[PDB]
Each structure stands twice: as structure tokens, then as C-alpha cells.
Design a protein around this nucleic acid. Sequence first.
RNA 1: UAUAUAUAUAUAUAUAUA
RNA 2: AUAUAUAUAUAUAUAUA
Lengths: 50, 50, 50, 1082, 38, 13
Amino acid sequence: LVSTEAQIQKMSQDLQLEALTIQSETQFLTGINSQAANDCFKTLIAAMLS
Amino acid sequence: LVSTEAQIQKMSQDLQLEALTIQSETQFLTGINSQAANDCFKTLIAAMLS
Amino acid sequence: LVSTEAQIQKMSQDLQLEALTIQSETQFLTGINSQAANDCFKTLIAAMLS
Amino acid sequence: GKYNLILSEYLSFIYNSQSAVQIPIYYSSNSELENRCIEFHSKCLENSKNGLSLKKLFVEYSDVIENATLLSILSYSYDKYNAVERKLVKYAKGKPLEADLTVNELDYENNKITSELFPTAEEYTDLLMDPAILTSLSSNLNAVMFWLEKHENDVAEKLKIYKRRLDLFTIVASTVNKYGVPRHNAKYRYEYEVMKDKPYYLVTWANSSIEMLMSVFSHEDYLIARELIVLSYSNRSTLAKLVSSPMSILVALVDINGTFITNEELELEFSNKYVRAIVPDQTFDELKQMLDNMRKAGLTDIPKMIQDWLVDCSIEKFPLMAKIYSWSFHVGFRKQKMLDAALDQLKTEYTEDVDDEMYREYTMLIRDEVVKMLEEPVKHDDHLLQDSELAGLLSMSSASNGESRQLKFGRKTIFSTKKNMHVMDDMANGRYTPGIIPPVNVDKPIPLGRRDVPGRRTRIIFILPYEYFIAQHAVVEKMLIYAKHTREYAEFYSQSNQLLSYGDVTRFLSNNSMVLYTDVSQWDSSQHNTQPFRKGIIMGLDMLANMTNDARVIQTLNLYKQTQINLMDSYVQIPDGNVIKKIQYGAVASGEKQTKAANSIANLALIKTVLSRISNKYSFATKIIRVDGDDNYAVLQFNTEVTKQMVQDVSNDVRETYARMNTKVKALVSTVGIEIAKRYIAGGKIFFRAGINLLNNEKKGQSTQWDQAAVLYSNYIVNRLRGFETDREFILTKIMQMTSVAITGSLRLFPSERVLTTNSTFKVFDSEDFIIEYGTTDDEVYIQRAFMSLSSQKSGIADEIAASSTFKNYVSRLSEQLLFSKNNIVSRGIALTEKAKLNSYAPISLEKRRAQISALLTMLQKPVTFKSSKITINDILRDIKPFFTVNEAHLPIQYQKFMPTLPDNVQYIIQCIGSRTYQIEDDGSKSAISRLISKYSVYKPSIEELYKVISLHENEIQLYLISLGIPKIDADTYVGSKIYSQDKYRILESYVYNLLSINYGCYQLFDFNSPDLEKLIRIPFKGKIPAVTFILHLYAKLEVINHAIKNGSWISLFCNYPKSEMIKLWKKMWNITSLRSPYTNA
Amino acid sequence: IKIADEVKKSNKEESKQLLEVLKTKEEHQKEVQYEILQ
Amino acid sequence: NKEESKQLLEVLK
RNA sequence: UAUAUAUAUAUAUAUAUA
RNA sequence: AUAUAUAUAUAUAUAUA
Ligand SMILES: Nc1nc2c(ncn2[C@@H]2O[C@H](COP(=O)(O)OP(=O)(O)OP(=O)(O)O)[C@@H](O)[C@H]2O)c(=O)[nH]1
Ligand SMILES: O=c1ccn([C@@H]2O[C@H](COP(=O)(O)OP(=O)(O)OP(=O)(O)O)[C@@H](O)[C@H]2O)c(=O)[nH]1
């Protein structure tokens, strides 16, 4: 996989994440890790197969 | 009701409140709580029935 | 009179003051108090009467 | 911790009695564990008061040992007599070294018995042999004997380190035991009644010998330490220079394979050029005569090492040759008498048959350089030359004056010699003339001082009166500004890193080029420095008296001319016996303000002439002439390739042409490397001197043991990075004795690892070497506030002098001369500068530091209960630290190592991320007031005073700016534009870049903006809260290196620092200081 | 200003940022009234 | 005697 | 349809250098 | 009863009745 520490950094520069502002773009980064990449690839294949 | 913790948290992103800037949008969150919800549903009805 | 603690707090929102910079709108609020409106009302009437 | 384990075995060695006990003291951040610490410390004081053990108590209170951290270890020792000599005879097995007598050219410098070298008691000056360190010989022998019993049973590799440090100890111990260990006083000064039968230079020999045998690691080290310990008992004079001699020649033999380079704007590149080393046959005949002077001196294992290297001439074995040169300076200082050091220096032979055709060009080249340095600040009437009386007096060095004067400050009279204290007396009694400087002639001569070099003959130095500082401050502060914007003077190449500054040597080195490094035998007292150097400068102030028009820029330029007329003839005042000897000395005065700004003029303007006369035979094209006082080089680029005859015929034409100006010199030329400072470019790899005497100071200081134990460690980390590995188990053993404090009789208090290694005023040594570690755990940030609470102390001497009628008459006479107004924010701001300037006086700063440590003893005998909510540097890093996520990452070795003497755990960082490319300057912005005050007035205010000014009224900022001397339209353009409001956010941000250091003993070598450290640091970016952004990318860049030094592996961080925690940290960074910041937390 | 108690005692990050933005507005509105007095 | 130190050294170890 | 400008704080101690 | 100049970098520390 693309490294989960190297992807949220690039995802924090495509957005304009800035402090001293309550943005709705801070929540674009929650729940991104490699444990949930191997969990959604499995529950999509294994739900269609059963 | 929709939870007053999870509503001002949702209202403060549609407003884009900015720290270090005195806006007229920081006052939209005054008096938003679940105790003045059941105090305005009643004053609107109990004044009509009397 | 209008209370000068609440007249500035409304005037400092139409102007949209931003901290950490030098704007030309923090000078719009200088010299506004009740000791001056009560002193500029007299310097206009009592200088026309004499 | 490892240091606590060395503590509890040092106690079990020095106190081998059943009457001895050790009581550990503990503290903790928990309020519950503090009451666990109070009850434990109370019971070990009652049970060990009456003969009850502690093995039944450490199990009952094992809830505090494994959880709280150690504060100190108390030591009960009912030992009446020191048992040093009782365990010295166990190692005193060898034959005692008999001293030699025919090896020195003097009598007092020979190693004779002190009864025969000094006949009676009264003429015993210990200042020839005094180590002047605050340890003893009796404490050094316990520091080696502790090491020689811990490492007795060793494995088959570590045994040979122990064995080579034992046969070198039987040389020391069997000589000390023959005469007995000398007993010092309480001031660590060896008296006469104990040195009656001992040989002179036994303390300073056995102190310099113990420093050597705690550095013998390999068999290449043992052959040097065997032939220097035996010989330094005999000849104290010639030995340090005979071994250190061929390293000036041996730097010219090695080839260049791949070298560093610095380009013109000082930044580091890497070059790959291959340059041969071309030496004639008169270098190998000058090297054989440097290896026969080392054979007549007795040593025979060193020139066998050099002659086994001359058949190689390779850079792979040059770390052995740099080791031999560095072990030479560890034999101890060459201290001699004040009479024989001056009269051998102030003796010189002048000659009227000198080439006068060469002096009138040398005088003119000094004339055209002094005018070139001051044509701009004199034609425009500068703000510092117009105030030469004040800018020289308000910023006055307070080191010393010539004589001892009975100064009377109100009630407390004091015998001081400090220079700013003489100004306060003479401005009170009216015997102070501003425009008259006193003549140093046959009446009122110049007093003398001395400075001791570890291998050089003891030199003298000149202490001019204070009126020769006010005359010379303003002009020479304008000559140091031009020395930082010229490519020739070596104030330009002066940075933190050493590859950047001394790396312009290897820019023009090729095979058609010839480098030329010359060292004059003595730069003071040369023939070309008496008359043609003064009269070249006096002529330069005649053409500068026509450049301006003021009555005040001429008057300060008629004082800087008057100090050169008065020094053309001079006299030095040196006493001997009961007579005072006045010696005429018209040459240059090492000790003025002028002594470095005019040793870079007089040596550039000399070598610009001697490079002109050798161009009658060889036509070349010189590239750089860098000059640093005496030590200068000058690269010459030729037409043909440089051969073995053009090197010989230039070294015979620079030596002879310097002899035409009666300047005795040796002139060395090479094509590969020089020795400009003590930093040596050899084969494209910079090699350093690495000789710092740990256990021998050149002079006794104004410091206590707790501060001299820090400079024992600070002289070790510089010695280790430069290639001289002293054993860390001996340095740690020597800190446990210097930081010892005797509370009562028979009770010593020893601080733990957490008292010494923490980041505070009471810092001695870092936990792991070469790195600063700010301890973010809760038991270690809590004790930092316990040490930052008592650092603010008051001394009673400095407050009896600050309320006198003399010190107030000096501030009010200095505040009236500066400002033509009334304001007291400067009079209360000048008086806080001279109260801070009086710390150079010895009993003031000693009563500051002794009130630091005697108030620490009340904190160390008890568990600490001081709870305070102060924001520290170590509290910022407690909030950043839980948001770092480490991950192991691999990183290759790309860049090349340029310093081969570095240790392995530091060199691996340089080979991965690279040596430093450019000196990072990220100091934010200076405030707009300090660019408005420092441009008109010469008063530089502190940044805690400019914040006090801004918070005043609008009409009280303008009164302050007009007070200093600023015109009205300039302050009213400042104040009216409301840029005093923007300077609240540039003073408060100026303390953020001051906070954390990218420079240290070790951190200067690395490249912090490297594209291999920026690959591991993965921090998401937030546009606002700029102060937090700097401290995140700096602490992340420091955390990877502090991990990669300790363990040799690289980690890659990820700091998703949330927006709610940045604004909590943004106000923590603005509230470190003690002033009103607009944004606080709570 | 006058925020409910369910937000002040919260623990999510998005309800912690709101409190440390309404706090730096009242620490800036109190400061622009002091700058007038300057 | 020195039986106390070997029980006190390993407290720190 | 619009996201400000600007390079040498001071003092003492300590080491490296001249 | 008490002697240690000047400059250049670098680091540590400090400012308050
Ligand atoms: N008393 C004293 N002890 C020192 C001194 N310097 C170092 N020590 C320590 O004392 C040990 C040597 O014994 P001594 O120097 O005679 O000190 P002591 O045991 O207190 O005996 P006295 O000096 O007579 O008080 C060494 O191992 C050091 O740890 C000192 O100046 N005075
Ligand atoms: O403490 C010092 C050291 C040096 N200097 C100044 O630096 C000059 C050069 O200092 P050097 O140490 O190079 O002098 P030198 O040439 O006499 O040395 P040797 O060959 O005898 O080993 C000196 O002549 C003096 O002007 C000082 O002013 N103060």
C-alpha cells in the first residue's frame, strides 16, 4: 500500500488545512489507515461471495 | 432531539468561524441548547391555547 | 446614550477587525466614549450661541 | 541510569568500612508518592542513626525505589585518615623514575628537588607548577584506583585496555609513592611545607600523566603514552614542541583524491579533483632534521611511527599521525617566570641596513587600507563616530586595568582592578579627562600580563589603561565592519561550522597552483612593526581628517591618531626582586583594541608586498590572500604544472625576501594542504588540534567546583569530537568528586544523575554524549522548575555598590551625556546594565554562585515539594511528545565524511544526511523600534525594555523616542502609523527562535535542511499559528538525530498535531517570558 | 459565547477546537478595547 | 561488613 | 469575483582561535 | 594581608520591593 503516514501529509497539502479556522476539511482525514484498507477490501469481496 | 454537542459542532463548520477575526458569525451559537428547545415549543403552544 | 462597551462591540463587527495585522480600521474606534459625545454636543451649540 | 550505578560502586570503594552507610533520597511528581518519599527518607535517618540496617526497609518501601527517581545519595564515613597511600602500595611495584638534570636550559624549569630549587620558605612561588584546577592529586589517584578494580576481571579484548592502563600506572604510582602523595590545603593549592622533600613538578606531572593513561585504548596509543610519561618527568620545556614539530611539514605530503570546497558566497560543495603532492628534496632534508631532534631528546618509539608512514604518504594512516601531534600537547603547560618570558620576548635585533625601498610601499599599503575602511563612515557623518566618548564608555569591557587601586564605594571599600570600576572612581573624584590620553613613556610605563599556551613558550601581554579603550573603540568598531565584507580578512570566514569557514583553502588547489602558508616567528617585536606600521596609520588619519567637516568626527580621529603617536615609543613595567625594570618597546602592543583589526591590515599589506617581489622570476596570478593576524596563506596559480623546482625556488624566494625586511620567517609551500590556524587541511580532510588539558588549567578562575566540573566535561566532549578519546568512566568518576559537597564533618552529599544532567543552571554533563535531552517525563520536568526557582539570587556586594553615591554619580553622568531629556526608563535601564556588568568582579559572582549551591543543599537533603506552574522549554516539549508516532526507516549512506577523527556514532549521521551546507539564520525579525533607536543613538536597549515602552501611552512612546535623539517627524511617522502595535508580535516571537539550538558541540556538523532528514519528517501543514510550525519542524528534526546517535538507526516521525492543541501551544510559546502577552491559556 | 454545557465538557476534537476559537476571540475583543486606551 | 553494599547496589540495578 | 512586509538585543562566565 | 589584556565565532546562565 501507499504508506499511511506519507498519504495524509499529501492529503493535508491538497486541501488548505489551516489552524485558527474551523474548517469542514479537517474531517477529510479521519479513519485513514492500513488496517481499514484490508478491512474494506475484505468485507466487499466476502459479502458478495456470501 | 439532535444532540446539542453534535449540532454546534456541525453549525461551526457551515459558518467557517475564524479565530483572530471578529466576525458577526460567532454570535449565531448563543443560546443553542436542549433546555430552550422545550421552552419555546411550550411558549408557542401555551400562549395560543390561552 | 448608547452604551460604549456595546457600541464598539457592534462597530468592531461591521468593520471585521483582524488581529496580528495593522489595518486602517482599528483607528475608526478611537476617541469614542460618553465623555466626548456629551462634550461635542456642547462645543457645537455653545459656539453658535456666542 | 548508568551514572547512578557508577555512583554506588564508587561509594563501596572509597568507604570500605562497616561504619559506612549510604542513604538514597527520592522524589516524585505524584502527591501520593511524595508522602511515600517523606516516610522512606525519615526512616533511613532514624534507623541508621542507631546501628540498624536497611535491607529490611528497602523491601517494605520497594514501592518507591522502582517508581520514583533518585535525588541524591548521602554518605556517612567515620574515617579519620585518607586511605589513598594504603592502597597505593598495591600498585607501587615498578622502579621509581629518577629525574634528569641536563635536559633543560634553565634552572627552575628543571626537575629538581624543591629544597634545592628554592633555598628558603619565603621565596616559594607555586605559580610555575600549579595545576590551578579545583581537584587534587589525592583525588585523582582514587579516580584511577576505582577504575583499576572495576575492570580487573575482564574478557580477552577489554583486558588489553586494562593491561595497558596498568603498566602505565606503575610508572606513575611507583614515583609518587617514593616521595608520598602531597597533601593540599582547602583552596587546592600545594603549600611549601608539604613540597619540602617532593620534587618540583610532581603534581603537574602526575596530573598530566593520569590524563594520558585514561586515554590509552590501542597499542598505537600505548607506545606514545609510554614515551611521553617517562620523558615529561625530565624535560618540561622542549618536549611539547619536538613532537608537535613535523605536523606543519607532514601536512604537505598527502595526495588529494576527493576534497571539500566552499564557493565564494560561503556555502559547501564537494569536489572530486586529483592533485599530486609535490615536495622537493629540501623538505625530506628538513624532515630528517626534525626526526633527529626527536632522537636526541630520548624518545624512540615516535619517529619509528613516522618513518613507517613516510614510505606510504597516504591519508588512510594519517589519523595515526594526527594522533601523535595531539598527544604532544597533553604533557602540561610550559609555565615559566615573568622575567624570563618577557626578556626573551622583548629582546630583538634591529638593523639600519633594511631595504627602505620596500618599506615606503609597505607604509603606503597600510595607508590605503585604513582610508579604504573609513572613507564611507567619515564622509557620511556616522552616528557612532560622533559619540566616541560615549559609545566607548557605555559599552566598556570590564576585564582588568593595569594596577590595583583602593576603590571606595560608599561604606564598603574594595581592592579591585576591573576596568569599568576605575571609570566610576575617576568620574566621581573628577580626575578623569575625556580628551587627554596618558602618555606611556619612561614615566608611567605599561604593566604586563601573561597567557599560557599548552605547547608554546610563555608569552607576555599588555594591559593598557582605560583611556586607551575609549579613544580606540569607535574607530575600530568601524574597522571590524569592513573586515566582515572583504574576502581577504578572516573575520569574514568565521561561522559556526568549520568546514564552511576553513574550506576556501581547497577552492583553487589544482596541479597548476601553489599554496603558500607562512608563519612569522614573532609578530610582535618585529622590525617591520615599530616605525612603518604606526606611521602608515597616522598618515591614514591625515587623509581622513580632510574627508569630513564636523568638529566631532575630526576630534575622535585626532584621538585615534594620538594613541599611535604615544605608542611609537613605549615602556613596559616588569619588576624583579625589588627593582623595577623599564624596558623600551616601540613595537606593536598585543592587548589594545587594535591588536586584531591592525594585525589583519599590517599582515595583508606586508604579504601584498612580498608577493610582488617574487614576481620578478616566476610569473603567476594570485587568487586569494586570506590573513588572520600572523597566520595567513596566499594561493598562487601558475602557467605550467607546478614541479619540484618551482616549489623549492618560491620557498627560497619568500623566505629571503621576508629577510630583506628584517622579518625572520619560515616559508612553507605545498599544493595539497596547509596549517592556517590549528585546524589542518590534509589531503582534503580537515584535521584538528584536539589538545585540551583536562586536569590542568593555565590559570585559576573565578569559578567554583560545580562550574569547574562542567568545564571538565565540556573539555572532554570537544576532545572526543576532535579525536582524543578519554574514558567516560574516568570523566564520570571525576564528576562524582568535584560535585561532592561536605555538609558537616564526616558527611558528604552526592547528587544523582537527575540533578546534574537536567537542563537548568546546575548542569554538568549530558546523559548520553553529544546531544541535549529535554526530559519530557513528569518526574523530570517537575525537578526542572525546582532548579529554575532558585537561580535568581542577590549578592550583597553588588547591592552595597549600586546604592553608593559614586555609582549613582556615574549613571547620572552617563544618562545626562546620552539623552537631552528627562525620562527614567533609560536611567533605570542603564543602571541595570552596569549592575549586570559588575559580575566580572570575582567576589560578586562568587557570592552569586555560592548562594545558588548553598540553597541547593537545602533542596537535596530533603525530597522536593516545590510545585509551580511555570512554562519552561521542558513544558513545551511535554505537550508535543505524545503526538509523535515513530516508525523504523532505512536510509542509505550517500555523502562523504570530511573529518576522519570523529567518533563512529557521529560520523554515521554525517555519512547519511550530510555535512552542513550553509549556516541557517532564522532569527525572525528585529523590532522596528530597535532599527530606529540603534540608527540615531548608540544606546542598545534590551528587548524587555522595548516591550515596556510599547505598552505605554501613545504620547509616552513619542516622548521616549525624542528622548534618545530621534527627530520629531521620524517618531511621529512611527507612532502615527501604529507600527508600535505590530511590534508586540515581533518581540514576543523573537523569544521562539532564541529557544532551541541547532548549534551545539555536535549539532553544528550536520545538515538540518537536508533532503534526507526532510524525507523522514512527515508533518502535515497548518497555515496559521506560525510560531508552532517552527517548533514542530525543529523538534522533529532534533528527535530523529537524538535517536540516530544513541542507537545507530533511523526513525521517521508523523505529527498530526490537531488544531485544538496548536492554539493551546501557541499561547504557551508566547508566555515563556515574564511580560504581558495578549494571548494566554488560563 | 454562552455555549451549552454539552460542548464545554466534551472530549471530541471538533468540540475542543470550537472552545479554543471562541476563547481567542474574547481574548482579542478584550485586547482591541485596550488598544483604544493606548 | 560489606554485605550491605551488594544488597544496596542491586537495589539501584 | 479578492488572502500584508522585512537580514548584526545586551552583560558576565566557559572553551576553541588570533 | 591577594595577579589574569583585546578581538572573533559558539554554548550555558541572567533581568523583578
Ligand atoms: N576533606 C577533603 N576531601 C576531599 C577533597 N577533595 C576530594 N576529597 C575527597 O576525599 C577523599 C580523600 O580523602 P581526604 O581528601 O583526606 O578527605 P577526608 O576523607 O574528608 O579527610 P580530611 O581531608 O582530613 O577531612 C577523596 O577520595 C575525595 O573523594 C578536599 O579538598 N578535602
Ligand atoms: O592572546 C593573544 C595571542 C595572540 N595575539 C596576537 O596574535 C599574534 C600572532 O599570534 P601567534 O601565536 O601566531 O604569534 P607568534 O608568531 O609569536 O607565535 P610563535 O611563532 O612564536 O609560536 C601575536 O603576535 C599578537 O599580536 C594577541 O594579541 N593575544
